[PDB]
Amino acid sequence: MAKLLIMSIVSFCFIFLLLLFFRYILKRYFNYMLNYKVWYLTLLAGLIPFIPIKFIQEFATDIHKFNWDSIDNICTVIWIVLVIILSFKFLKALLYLKYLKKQSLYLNENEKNKIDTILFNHQYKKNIVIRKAETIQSPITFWYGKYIILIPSSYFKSVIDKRLKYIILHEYAHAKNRDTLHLIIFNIFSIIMSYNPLVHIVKRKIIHDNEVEADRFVLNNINKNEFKTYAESIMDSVLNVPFFNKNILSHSFNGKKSLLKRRLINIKEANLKKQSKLILIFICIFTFLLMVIQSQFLMGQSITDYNYKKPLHNDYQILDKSKIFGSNSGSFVMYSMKKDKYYIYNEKESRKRYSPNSTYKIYLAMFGLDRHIINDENSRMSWNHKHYPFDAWNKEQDLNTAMQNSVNWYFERISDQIPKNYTATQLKQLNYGNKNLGSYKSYWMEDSLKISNLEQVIVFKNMMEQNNHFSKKAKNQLSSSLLIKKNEKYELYGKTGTGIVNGKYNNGWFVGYVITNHDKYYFATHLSDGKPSGKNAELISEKILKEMGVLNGQ
Amino acid sequence: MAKLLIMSIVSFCFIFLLLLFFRYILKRYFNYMLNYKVWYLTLLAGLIPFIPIKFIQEFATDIHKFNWDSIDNICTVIWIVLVIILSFKFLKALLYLKYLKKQSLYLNENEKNKIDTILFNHQYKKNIVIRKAETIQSPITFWYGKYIILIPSSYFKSVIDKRLKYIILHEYAHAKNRDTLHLIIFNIFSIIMSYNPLVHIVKRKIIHDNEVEADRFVLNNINKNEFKTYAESIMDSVLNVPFFNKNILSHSFNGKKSLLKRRLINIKEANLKKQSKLILIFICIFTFLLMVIQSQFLMGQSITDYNYKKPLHNDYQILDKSKIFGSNSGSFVMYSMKKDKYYIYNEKESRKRYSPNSTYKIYLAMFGLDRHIINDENSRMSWNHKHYPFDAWNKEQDLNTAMQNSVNWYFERISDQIPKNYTATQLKQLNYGNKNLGSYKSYWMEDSLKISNLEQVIVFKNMMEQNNHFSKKAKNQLSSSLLIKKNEKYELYGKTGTGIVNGKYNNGWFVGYVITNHDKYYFATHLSDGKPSGKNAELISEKILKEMGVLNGQ
Numbered sequence A, B: 001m002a003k004l005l006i007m008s009i010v011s012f013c014f015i016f017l018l019l020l021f022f023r024y025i026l027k028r029y030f031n032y033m034l035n036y037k038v039w040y041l042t043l044l045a046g047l048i049p050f051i052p053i054k055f056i057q058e059f060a061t062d063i064h065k066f067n068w069d070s071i072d073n074i075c076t077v078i079w080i081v082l083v084i085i086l087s088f089k090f091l092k093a094l095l096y097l098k099y100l101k102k103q104s105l106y107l108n109e110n111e112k113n114k115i116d117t118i119l120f121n122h123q124y125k126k127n128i129v130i131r132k133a134e135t136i137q138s139p140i141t142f143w144y145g146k147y148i149i150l151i152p153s154s155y156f157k158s159v160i161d162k163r164l165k166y167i168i169l170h171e172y173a174h175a176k177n178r179d180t181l182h183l184i185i186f187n188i189f190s191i192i193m194s195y196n197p198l199v200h201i202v203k204r205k206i207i208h209d210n211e212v213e214a215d216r217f218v219l220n221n222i223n224k225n226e227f228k229t230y231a232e233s234i235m236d237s238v239l240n241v242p243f244f245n246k247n248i249l250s251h252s253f254n255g256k257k258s259l260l261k262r263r264l265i266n267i268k269e270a271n272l273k274k275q276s277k278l279i280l281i282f283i284c285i286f287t288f289l290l291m292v293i294q295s296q297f298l299m300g301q302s303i304t305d306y307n308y309k310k311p312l313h314n315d316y317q318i319l320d321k322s323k324i325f326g327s328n329s330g331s332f333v334m335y336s337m338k339k340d341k342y343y344i345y346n347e348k349e350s351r352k353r354y355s356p357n358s359t360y361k362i363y364l365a366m367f368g369l370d371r372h373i374i375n376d377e378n379s380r381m382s383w384n385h386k387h388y389p390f391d392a393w394n395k396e397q398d399l400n401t402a403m404q405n406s407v408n409w410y411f412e413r414i415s416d417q418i419p420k421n422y423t424a425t426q427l428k429q430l431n432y433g434n435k436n437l438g439s440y441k442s443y444w445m446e447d448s449l450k451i452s453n454l455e456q457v458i459v460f461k462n463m464m465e466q467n468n469h470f471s472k473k474a475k476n477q478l479s480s481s482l483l484i485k486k487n488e489k490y491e492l493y494g495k496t497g498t499g500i501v502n503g504k505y506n507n508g509w510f511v512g513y514v515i516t517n518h519d520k521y522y523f524a525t526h527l528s529d530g531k532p533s534g535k536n537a538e539l540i541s542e543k544i545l546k547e548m549g550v551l552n553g554q
């Protein structure tokens, strides 16, 4: 529901921007102003969506969901705190102003005679207060319910400055316009709307425009001949003295910063000095070390998904089997144990590291067997009676079943029961791709562990013939669990399947080995285009393996 | 990979904030200054994460994914465009300067004599050039490796200004510091870093300091007696001339705005024009209409999930069956057709609405049958050839199969083929909870449609016995499809199962009716705590139903 504030922000902004648009045009073409009261409309807009005017078998299955409500709970607390802070700041300022008010003093007759001389031409209701002070360096004013104008006593002493009449007209207009009343009203609203920072932008614009209107007023009551003087006189007020911004809830002649002002202050002040160079030196040293620290951990690129770059250690040949892949564009690798030679189709692609998906079960099964979580005599794993997508997964499984029916459940348990260090050790000895087992129990499926087709051939070959860091028993049960098909030319062992995301097949694989009447082959097929299904990867591998003589005994 | 960009932002801000902090302290406590060149450190820090370093069935597994890649692709193009725009703007300013470079003239001997007198005791390297032009209302400077300093031709003749001396030193400082060059360099970089506003923001710190240092150079070479004069000279320029900001790439005495200046401008602009009141009126009207359009679409609420306070239209009593539920805290309702009475356990909970989940099928089957999408002679639905958690669903089903095995697949097709208006009309006639069927065919499973235990009792009872908006065929085939258990005392009809979210069992249900040798009983059991499984809801119901006479005929 915090989103509802976002919605009112958007509306608020639509209104704001439209109004802002007009403001620009009005001035740009006709020197027109938009009465700032219009801004109250955005404030109203700020609450639109806010106000809720909306006027047998047991079944069981898992649905993924995110809880975003705990976030709003956190945001709620923050908003509360912000209000507390903002409310306080308002109050602090207010208290001060009240305290000051209590110290103010009325004027004498001659002073009144002057003030009256200045404003009698307006013939207004004197329901405002003109007082003086011994505190403030320049005049200020604040509504409170009394409209009090405070002029430092020195300005009455220096009655002779003449320009006081400008000062009076200026403040008169501010009082007339109830500027500090509108300000505090808006401030309350802004305090409440802690969720929309734009409110602090519009208040600034309002304040500026209000000041402009006062200038017009004042000028409109002054003989133009004196405008030169006027401009100088007004300007002098921010030249002669420093400014302070304590009175955030009220109006004054010199209460805010500018870069110009900072310079002038800095100039007046005795600020010509030098420092030991050690300051910069240590800052740059420590900044550097931080940068180093960050560097130690901040890095990376698309390179994570890249291919295998090495030449081969055994003899090699490049293949062209593109006619077989057809619409299922992909890649393929085969290796002859007898010849110590690789045959590679579409090498640039066959080299790409891909998540192994279902083919990892070949290795995972081996790991479970070697670690004796599953053995030959008893290769079974338990389950938790939750429902699974295939009948094979709603049964307890042995290894033979689990491999051929790709039982993720079985294998989730196989992963769960094998130490990460073991898995990492064997991924390293096997030269298994990026050797990354992640932290996810099913790290091989559309996740962290990646291997190319070329690597998959090299790696499975190592699993059977070069890697002697597993017991023979593991190799043997795995072999039996991998048989797919046997006939008079070959024994085809392995496992196919596909990585599928949001219902689309993207990573079809078939990995294994072939015992033929003439040689022993290792292979890996991967499909990415067309319909890169499990069965298609299997069929593509077989058509190629037939052409290469693997499945023909040739 | 936008995340690397995010890392860049983070790295930058860390150094930036650290540095900013240090700078604050230096000035805040001792008016110490740190050479702005340190800001290059943030730019450099921003490059850290961009270093590309690391220093036998067919199966597939369907993984849900968020596509953030299309977003980065789009964002990349945008980033490119933003760079182009910035480059363009830079160039246009540069070309303007290019023009000026071919326009101004060097100075004569006496003017040189004046300047040399000014810098006589400074003994600065003079590999700089001072030139004059009618195009300059106030002096400007630009690097180009030449230190091009221009003055108004208008002051050439001002033999008594006594300001040039300040002008020269001010200009000198900027030339000396190669401030313009540094800004050019920074501009290259900020053009590149289109994604992180701080890269441009920081320039304003640089610019301010550049001016500060120039003031120091000036003051450092001035008999303090005249410091006041210098300050007056600054303001004189501020007041005396308008500024223009074409030279966004260089420095000048009068090239920028300020609030003060705006006011001074306004004083000097006698824009004595009338503005019709229609201006604000129409703007306010249009704004209102904008608000109206948003309003008719913007409205939020927590109300959707509010349960009801509605009294019943038949007799009732409140139950306490807490020793049956035990650790499986939940709720329960039963209704007697002959007594016209409800029995409500833990009504504070039984009156809450939950998605019907596994039991919606009871009602959906009545609808599918009434519309004859499934009928008695042919109650079947087609299959999409996808695999599901239950063996029973990996096929085409009839109603009797589908009801007993909770076949959402079958029922999802039923949902698609029942006009939403018919479903909704009867959800309303039956008082089916929030009567919300969403927009999804599977709306009953941890989704939009919600109903209480009390309401399910009411709904089924009406749907089969009191509601005459459904056919006899529907009533009869439904009753058959719902049978789950029976013996010589009762026939128990109904269904059970549980909605599970992120692996946790949240909404367990058992809903049904019993036909006995005595009466007709309608009921619903729901579990939320403990292990709120379907079977538990069913077992709890059976224990209660026996006590309530439902399963015995009492």
Ligand SMILES: [Zn+2]
Residues within 6 Å of the ligand: A170, A174, A211, A214, A251, A252, A253
């Ligand atoms: Zn004012």
Ligand SMILES: [Zn+2]
Residues within 6 Å of the ligand: B170, B174, B210, B211, B214, B251, B252, B253
């Ligand atoms: Zn400067």
